[PDB]
Design a protein around this ligand. Structure first.
Ligand SMILES: NS(=O)(=O)c1c(F)c(F)c(SCCO)c(F)c1N[C@H]1CCc2ccccc21
Length: 258
């Protein structure tokens, strides 16, 4: 009886195994755009994905992860609200059963069809496992997806999904360039939070871009053919793998713009 996104193990239950689910800096949150404070001290985000080395794509039973070899100084996030360098380890998405839901963060209560999370760990802690034990261990760049025009740089992901339909499946996934998933603008909101999945550790500086990318209905439809079950088990479509917005508590969301 492990955690998930089904009818009886979802976000509302997670606190029983992971009591920080009710903690002081949980994610996601609703971004009240009127209340977010412009901070002229925030720096442009520096996203340096020029040397990124993807390796593999994995169906982990909750989402799929596109993995990067993070053993060298290659794909890094810095600037913005960050002190120091954070190295890209993987990206994944959260999405809905319908175009009208799927994002984890919301913007003035608006839900997007999906949300991309590029996960980075602070190199001052040496590797990801030690970083997640620290309050400044991770930086997650969140990007909203809306349904409209196709995102060409997404299609190589979408096309491999048939090979990783079910939980535990992986496939080689080299030479994938995450720059093709970025929107035009790097304007962002930022706040201190957590992983949005168990173990819900309070280790994340969130950086959520204001500009959503567009993907086509056909692309998101392919995400929704994935399965949460393993091979040889009854089909459980991988949809609605998002945690709802959590209490903001004693936090301020800062804006890099306007
Ligand atoms: N979505 S997240 O921002 O809270 C997250 C992280 F912040 C992470 F650091 C990690 S580990 C990244 C290194 O393998 C995640 F797996 C996930 N999430 C993955 C892992 C479990 C899960 C379930 C549903 C969608 C995605 C995922």
């Amino acid at each position: 009886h492990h955690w998930g996104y089904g009818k009886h193990n979802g976000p509302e239950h997670w606190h029983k195994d992971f009591p920080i689910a009710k903690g002081e800096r949980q994610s996601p949150v609703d971004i009240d755009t009127h209340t977010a404070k412009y901070d002229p001290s925030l720096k442009p985000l520096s996203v340096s994905y020029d040397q990124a080395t993807s390796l593999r794509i994995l169906n982990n039973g909750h989402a799929f992860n596109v993995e990067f070899d993070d053993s060298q100084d290659k794909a890094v996030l810095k600037g913005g609200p960050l002190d120091g360098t954070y190295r890209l380890i993987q990206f994944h998405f959260h999405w809905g059963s319908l175009d009208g839901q799927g994002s984890e963060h919301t913007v003035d209560k608006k839900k997007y069809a999906a949300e991309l999370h590029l996960v980075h760990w602070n190199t001052k802690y040496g590797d990801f496992g030690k970083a997640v034990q620290q309050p400044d261990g991770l930086a997650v760049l969140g990007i909203f997806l809306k349904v409209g025009s196709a995102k060409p740089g997404l299609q190589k992901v979408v096309d491999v999904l048939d090979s990783i339909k079910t939980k535990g499946k992986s496939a080689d996934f080299t030479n994938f360039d995450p720059r093709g998933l970025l929107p035009e603008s790097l304007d962002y909101w930022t706040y201190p939070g957590s992983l949005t999945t168990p173990p819900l550790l309070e280790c994340v500086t969130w950086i959520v871009l204001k500009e959503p990318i567009s993907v086509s209905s056909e692309q998101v439809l392919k995400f929704r053919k994935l399965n949460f079950n393993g091979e040889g088990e009854p089909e459980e479509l991988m949809v609605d793998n998002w945690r709802p917005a959590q209490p903001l508590k004693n936090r301020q969301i800062k804006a890099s713009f306007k």
